[model samples]
Target: FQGHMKLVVCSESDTAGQNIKDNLLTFADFEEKDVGEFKLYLSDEFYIAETKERLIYADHIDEKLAKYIDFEEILFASRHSSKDGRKIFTVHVSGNVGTADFGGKPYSLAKPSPQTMKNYVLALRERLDRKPEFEFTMEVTHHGPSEISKPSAFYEIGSTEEEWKDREAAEVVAEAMLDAIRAEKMDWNVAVGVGGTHYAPRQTEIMLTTTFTFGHNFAKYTFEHLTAEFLVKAVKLSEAEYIIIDEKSVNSAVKKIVNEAAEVAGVEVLKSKKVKKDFRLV
Candidate 1:
């Protein structure tokens, strides 16, 4: 348990919302407390809240609401969708590419805390009870609720209706979020991910097994639309120590252009194949 933490849970109107709430009560060490208009659960390291809605869409946090919260580091505990029935459990940080329709404005990214990104991925990866056919991946940068000053991201269970309704599946991700937030402090590295598909399996493996984790990642498909300006935003907002370019994933032209753009921003860029391990993190 740590001294600084807060968990956000929304109204039970959402199906996955309610399941996550139930699991938190049964599986974690959270204590209930009242604060302002918000319903809260207090723990040494966890300040869990039954907030207004999903954490990812909270682009506007009024001053009145902000005053009541204690911790700045946040991650949304939410559900995923293959809406097409892919059946997966996923954990990833969020940032918008070229529009504000979802969360942030056009071409802007939310400020990311490297430590939070690393802790969230590692904790979620190791704490799950048993995934069976379920899979976990760090998804690429996308969607709305585009702004939050604190280090924030999302952890979710996805794909099938049955899995969403299954208490065990919900509990698994819920526990993982808790484990991540309550994890031991570390000197972690954060980077802007480049390459891989929507579900960044390579980044997932790196975050789970090494000391590196990523914030906003531009996949090969997205590079065509990515701007050099947006590339700088990923580095600055993520507070990146460097850029991790997945050389094998991007085309030669994109790799050249993006690396050139990174140099212009005064940030170091390294290809994924050369992302050496300094340690085996559990």
Candidate 2:
């Protein structure tokens, strides 16, 4: 019997995860308790739990948590890393389209909670002024813990150690996370994105200004390994209605595969350009 409550997961060893946890404690009146090996924080509205394992490699960790807490969905609070070290607040579903170098099994995807992801993105956008230096982006799907059965998503503070330790930025994320938990349900179109840089700039812009949210997104780097069968898996898991592609980055071969996948999945394929023009989003 699962309760209608959201669970925010924090990794004890992750700097950003710990930072978010500290701020969440300050933002609300949550009572702390011990749930076996895990430390749990409970409030009337939601829950926060800390685990010792790195989130990306913690396969089936949700199942472990389920034994203790009956929650609706999970929101992983994590830190992001990039070679360029851009200051960003990013959101993405966890999975590996090609190889499992970091965490979960190769080519496996975790179930995505599209609405929560959309809500979180919108919440962060609303609070952007608090940390105007951080840019918001939707990263293409990558990494592990892809075996979870429940709907899940990741919210991250990224780029460097300095950003990870920023208490003020963490507070904004904490506020945003709570705001999303309280957000009213909206009829946002859920989609699976294809083709873009790792950061998915085009997809990010559309999500920010329009009533659209993404599930798992495959960047151009993963195109060589993407197949119709696998793409359909993402669509089905995401409960996506459309497959949006970055026209400039996707070649004909990739488009053909995407088209084939869309036909099999019985979903529509849309171009980022057309979506931007038709939806009138920033």
Candidate 3:
């Protein structure tokens, strides 16, 4: 187990808010001391407050209230945008205060020095191995007129509607976030795979087969040339999700020959499926 880690759970009043709190306590490796958790703010009718003593209860951290707590790292739990309007457990990555934006307006509460925020964003990018799709910007004012800090960003967790009631998914997301943080701290390896096809029929088929077989962990057999019969046999043996054949090289004659071979080998060849819409023949 890791020595100590802090998790801050903040959200507005809704089912999503309760879900976040419940999921964190259930799934994460968080002890009572490791969590500084808060919930929605309520009126004073339900509770009593002492003048000088600290009031221990679940409520939103207002602007004036935020001044009392000193924290190094921050995480937010709230409603976010999605294709179907909103969904539970959709994680959005914002690089830094300056880069993350919403409707052309900056979303960050405080503006860190450009250099300081740059390092934070760069470190996050290196670990994730890609740039964030969303933007981050600095905000001048908040609800309570509190002075904002440089390193804080808001997160939208889910919507307030029905059809997305999977609270368990939040736990999975929190675990993944924690894992990413640990990986960044320890300098973990990021794996990637790339492949492309050239315009020669026999050459393209051979290269494609060879590359896929060699790169993946499942392929055990090796072949110098992959004919239609060989490809059919390979497909039957492997059940691969995708098969790339150069359209420029495999003309009608070659395609028919391959199809016959596939038929003989008891393997059905379907039309190629595109993994990405923009990926096309050259």
Candidate 4:
């Protein structure tokens, strides 16, 4: 009933990534084989590629190997912990909003699926409720390796090195991921959010409780470099129908920029609160 989709899993060849691969295999039946630089776990409807390179650089593989596999969509899975000194167990989607110069050119964002993003959030919450020890939240797109052509998103867990290796956490993350893939579709509006922090508190709140499933989100920090081109790229990449703004997070002047861009793109711009009520099929 749908086009073929695959999962892109990567870790250093020496270690780390193996746990995710092993845990992932426990979910469903997979036929293992070697495909170019990738070790593939192929299934009837889905396939998973285990790579040695960092997942952020995964776009490089798409250019070289995607032709052989011919997948329509990709989901990247990995572990996360930051030097920011945050310890949490969470699952979130990834996208590029501004130029980081790590993975792709500045302003280039990957296509995001609001439906998939929403489902992933719900799936994480359902499982994460049992473990309050970890805090889960969505991260704003801010990192290298943003280069990719296929419709893609990242699912990650663990906020510290110790947690990254937690087999228990891996099991939960892997289960939640499977749950996301099996999730039913919701007719949610797609939006590109403006004004928030890197972790995207305001944008994340909208996602957790709203009629819109967000794609590329530009935090206030990125607003400095935000341009009409970036705004349009995000809208197109996410296939967004609406632009949601966190008024307080963005200054009135910067707000005008985002709005003007959305206006030119012919996409509706709505304040955050107005979204769930206006859209969501009453």
Candidate 5:
């Protein structure tokens, strides 16, 4: 039954994805069905499937899966790669802003489901006891599957092969996903974030302490390519009511574009500092 069901899309080619899918099977009971290209694990609450293609390049996967099942959102179970070799969990919406170098069209954005992400972040923090060694952060919006029909987000396990092979970490992520999907809805201030580093330290802190959850976040490196037009696209796609920026990292050039975009999108402009102060722990 597809009633109120969500789909977790895993990639057979990804080590972390495989680990997560295995844990999901262990944690939840499902009836298996051979669905042509991929096997489907059916449950009352959600469904799980693994595709042979890489998650990032699997554009229009929602449409492809529509032939058999229906889902409200697509949560990609994937691996995160970083040179730092730190063990971390990350979440982000899929899309490209300036270049198609990763896996999506240049200057295109994917639809974002803010509440689901917010709920997931909250769930991750609460379940940290499962894998105390792991830290979580929200990565800025990047990558592909930008042409998909449903709102999607990537829940990832990061860094080296050693971390990817950590079954415990993958199980923690799997548990967090289940908790996030089943948690009661929360009222969160949704916004499009700008500035800071790729890991978005300032925004991550704000989210951890405050009631804000970011949609599509742009890192400081993207400032040169960020324009009112593109920023507005992020705002619209995110369904954001405010534009939050890392004030210290943003220069006048980036500030101008943010102001203009906020005006056009009819959303308020909030600095990370103000958000932390006002949205304190409530």
Candidate 6:
């Protein structure tokens, strides 16, 4: 029997609904009965067997359901409901029940529900692990006979034709759900930037040539090729910042070319170095 809190589980069809019912029964003991054709379960510890008046049933939930009971005090579950602004936890068993189609055409079909369920589970888990004092907002609109509400979530347990066929997939979903319910909730912000080696050479050339060319951008034309000597002269003329040479370009042949260029350009060469940045996520 539920004491401090209550849980509501609903599905699109009887088979799927029964699966959720069975799963819940495995965790907590409750009284099971039939109210007309609909099956209802009430926690025995909190229920009065004589009146059968306080028993929770799926059919009695609607606009007036809140009039007899405090919506805040009750945790209601339904496959689909017409009421709005009520905090009802919904589980969708049928696939593609409310999915958007790209072609502007709505198809009467069911799609896989596990992926959506998994995503919701992860999101809930993140929130639970981060924050606790959160009040959910609810708004509703009529979608044919079903009430489409912003705060109410629809969970797809499976398709209309099957229930709990894949045990491994179900276990993954179950873990996500349990984690979500236990974790704190919080908001997250993220920023990302991309950096590479292209700027190093260009920056070096610009600073060096600016010194010799002095208001002219023709410094590159004075040398047949970029040599160590040329870079050394450029560095001295410009009093340039740190020089970054690709490791492959620092060999003996390249060094000779640079030394000769530096002598011709009348620049001083400093010790060469390499700069690197770590790009791994922890």
**Which one wins on TM-score?**
2
lDDT of each: 0.68, 0.91, 0.30, 0.69, 0.87, 0.29
Tens-digit per-residue lDDT, 1-282, candidate 3: 211232233433434434555554544343332223333222211110111111112212333334433433334444443454433332222221222223222222221122222222233323322213222221111221112232223333444354224454444444444443333332211100111221122222221222221111101111123245544433333233334333433456545645665566654433323212223222
Lowest lDDT sum, 10 consecutive residues, model 3, at 213-222
Task: Provide the RMSD of all predictions against the true structure, rounded to 1 decimal.
Answer: 3.2, 1.3, 20.5, 2.8, 1.6, 24.8
* Residue pairs with clashing backbones, model 3: 78-157, 79-156, 99-136, 100-135, 100-136, 100-137, 101-135, 101-136, 106-137
lDDT of 6 by residue, 25-93 (tens): 544466765544334455632211111122222223322333222221122222223223232222322
Sort the predicted structures by lDDT, highest score first.
2, 5, 4, 1, 3, 6
Specify the poorest-scoring 10-residue window by lDDT in model 1.
1-10
Which stretches of model 2 miss by more than 4 angstroms? none
Alpha-carbon lDDT of model 6: 0.29
Better of 4 and 5 by lDDT: 5
Prediction 4 TM-score vs. true: 0.89
Which residue pairs in candidate 1 collide?
Answer: 5-47, 6-47, 7-47, 7-48, 7-49, 102-144, 103-144, 103-145, 103-146, 104-146
lDDT of model 1, residue 60: 51
Clashing pairs in 5: none
Ranked by TM-score, the better of candidates 3 and 4 is 4
lDDT of model 5, residue 194: 93
- Candidate 3 Cα outliers beyond 4 Å, as residue runs: 1-7, 27-68, 81-83, 86-147, 180-183, 186-282
Candidate 5 C-alpha lDDT tens digits along 113-168: 78888888887888887777789898988889787757779999988898899998
- Candidate 1 has what TM-score? 0.85
Name the better of 1 and 2 by TM-score: 2
Give the residue spans of candidate 5 off by over 4 A.
1-3
